[PDB]
């Protein structure tokens, strides 16, 4: 195939529970995380929105601080440290790689795109080693605006040379395969822990569902 | 004094807690509240810059559901229809009243702006007895856009026929605070409970910050000379 794949990188590739630690010591709650995550998304859309940008792991901190505010805990630079170690560090799914092969010999292209800005490296995927499965790591910091602005997808496609008609975005988040699909690329959904899709009127279904990335990578082979 | 005062109405004015015994039945944990809220505000944002429009207390009702499947929670049409009718029925903080008596009488105009769709009468504000206190009620819902768009805070402006100086954004959120300062507006802060500033190098703090409606009341009277 000539088929280009886009994956998002947190949670989807990477495994944002391994965060649990680090909210049961400072929270007394591991549950927590599902409280910060959706608050730190929430809060780069609102600079988006209104134009500002900050680095998703400026963000990331600065929300971890206010969660802390809110449910009345301390925290020391120590902790914000340790926030930025276990978020550039998150181990990948043990279904990945597989699934990857297999995606890789079936003649897919396969290409990451993160709201996480670029670093040194290692890189987050260089430190889990399926770093190299990837033809390009993308970002949004080129865009300055997160997902899921149009631009971020837009600019993704012209740097591919590729056709919307070319890409499927993959996540497990609804918000982010919503945005691809809304610039009139395919959506695959993979169900993370924690993440199913969200079923609205009028906003558009994945074009392909799987229950962890092996079998959404069937389902896109199997789609011929 | 001349300030028009728009504010947020659900979770700022109206109790969002009222909704505790929903998530406590449904998920046998109350706090869950506060993981179904931020995705819900998230999900009204990712509407608003993919082009896409339904009602708020709509994506309310996706979002439980989709906040339940993570949980492996059952849910029926039942939890759906209390989730609209707590929603819609949120009571008002004891300290609001109060607060805006004071404002009035301070010669300030007093506007409520909401993501939440218009609804038959009574609404939310008439049934919590609060209503009265407003010149005018206003809603994202022609523009079909939410907050914090640009255009949301802009068309409030040109609705009430004022000035961006004119007008300060109220409400327990920053992220609503943000999209009217952005705009021209001032900015005043309510901490409700659960609810702090993020603060965020190079993004603008709140004009004025109350840890309740009485508080926030006091600096807005002491600075708000104009």
Same mark, same amino acid.
């Given at each position: 195939?000539?088929? %280009?794949?886009?994956?998002? /990188?947190?949670e989807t590739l990477l495994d944002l529970t391994?965060?649990? @630690?680090?909210?049961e010591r400072v929270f007394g709650d591991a549950? /927590? ?7 730190? %998304?929430?809060?780069? #859309? ?14 990331? +901190? ?17 902790? =914000? ?30 290409? *990451?795109? *993160?709201?996480?800005? @670029? ?9 889990? !080693? =399926? ?12 865009? #300055? ?16 040379? +590729? ?6 975005? %993959? ?6 395969? =919503? !945005?691809? #699909? ?7 959904? /993979? ?13 558009? #279904?994945?074009?392909? =569902? ?10 896109? %082979?199997?789609?011929?």
């Open positions: 195939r000539s088929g %280009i794949l886009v994956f998002d /990188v947190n391994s965060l649990s @630690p680090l909210f549950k /927590v995380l599902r409280e910060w995550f959706p608050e730190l %998304i929430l809060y780069s #859309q609102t600079l988006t929105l209104t134009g500002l940008y900050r680095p998703f792991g400026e963000i990331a +901190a600065a929300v971890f601080e206010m969660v802390a505010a809110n449910h009345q805990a301390k925290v020391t630079p120590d902790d =914000i440290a340790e926030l930025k170690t276990r978020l550039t560090s998150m181990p990948a799914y043990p279904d990945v790689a597989p699934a990857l092969t297999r995606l890789q010999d079936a003649g897919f292209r396969l290409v *990451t795109l *993160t709201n996480s800005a @670029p670093s040194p490296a290692p890189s987050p995927l260089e430190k889990a !080693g =399926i770093a190299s499965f990837f033809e390009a790591h993308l970002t949004v910091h080129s865009s #300055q605006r997160f997902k899921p602005h149009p631009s971020v997808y837009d600019s993704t496609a012209e740097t591919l040379g +590729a056709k919307p008609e070319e890409l499927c975005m %993959i996540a497990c988040n609804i918000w982010d395969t =919503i !945005g691809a #699909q809304a610039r009139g690329w395919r959506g695959g959904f /993979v169900a993370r822990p924690h993440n199913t899709p969200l079923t609205l009127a009028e906003v558009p #279904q994945p074009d392909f =569902i799987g229950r962890d990335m092996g079998e959404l990578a069937d389902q896109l %082979i199997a789609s011929l």
